[PDB]
Homo-oligomer: A and B are copies of this chain.
Amino acid sequence: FPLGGSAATDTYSGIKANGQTWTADDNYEIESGNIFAMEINLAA
């Protein structure tokens, strides 16, 4: 596994009055899909 556990890009917000709007609260980070990986056969 990687040290941090992600290599992600960005994501802003949405409160969505019928229109996924925004969320002052949040402010421009999510990396979709499980963590990057690295594999070893530590027994063989």
* Chain A residues packing against B (C-beta within 8 Å): 1-3, 37-40, 42
Flag if A40 contacts B37 (CB, 8 Å).
no
Ordered nearest first, which 4 A-B pairs have the shortest CB separation?
A3-B37, A3-B39, A1-B39, A38-B38
- Closest Cβ of chain B: how far from A7's Cβ, in Å? 11
A2 & B38 in contact (Cβ 8 Å cutoff):
yes
| A1 proximity list for chain B (CB < 8 A) | 38-40
Known contacts A1-B40, A42-B42, then 7 further A-B pairs from the complex at CB < 8 Å, ordered by chain A residue = A1-B38, A1-B39, A2-B39, A3-B37, A3-B38, A3-B39, A40-B40
A5 to chain B, nearest CB (A): 11
